[PDB]
């Protein structure tokens, strides 16, 4: 439930954007992290690395950001 | 040496931003290839400069 409830906030704390929320959890809110998150903001990019890129592109399922059609390609 | 410069930086711009029209995920938000070593910074300024100066370009075309 609490690990619910963050995830819950980091699809709030952004917007309608699950990706991001999952690339924020992953790697972090904040730290090295932190410019991903921004740099997400920007397209998929290569500003996100080795286990960033992987990991968002699996949660390719629901839902349903923009970057999420953006990803591939 | 604001000539030299705009000059400079605005070619570049137009390549980097004819490679986003032709390709894909180029990237022209503002921080583009400063390297040059003559375009040294880019101001705000080029890319509103830019894309006057190449609309009105394109209306004095053939």
């Keep these: 439930n609490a690990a619910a409830k963050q995830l819950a906030g980091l699809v709030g704390k952004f917007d309608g954007d699950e990706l991001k929320a999952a690339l924020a959890y992953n790697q972090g809110e904040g730290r090295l992290g932190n410019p991903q998150l921004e740099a997400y903001s920007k397209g998929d990019f290569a500003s996100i690395s080795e286990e960033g890129r992987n990991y968002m592109r699996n949660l390719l399922d629901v839902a349903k950001s923009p970057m999420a059609g953006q990803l591939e390609t | ?62």
Excluded: C
């Design chain 2, 1 to 62: 040496d604001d000539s030299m410069k705009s000059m400079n930086k605005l070619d570049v711009i137009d390549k980097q931003f004819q490679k986003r029209i032709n390709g894909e995920w180029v990237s022209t938000d503002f921080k583009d290839m400063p390297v040059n070593e003559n375009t040294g910074e880019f101001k705000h300024s080029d890319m509103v400069n830019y894309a006057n100066k190449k609309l009105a370009e394109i209306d004095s075309m053939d």
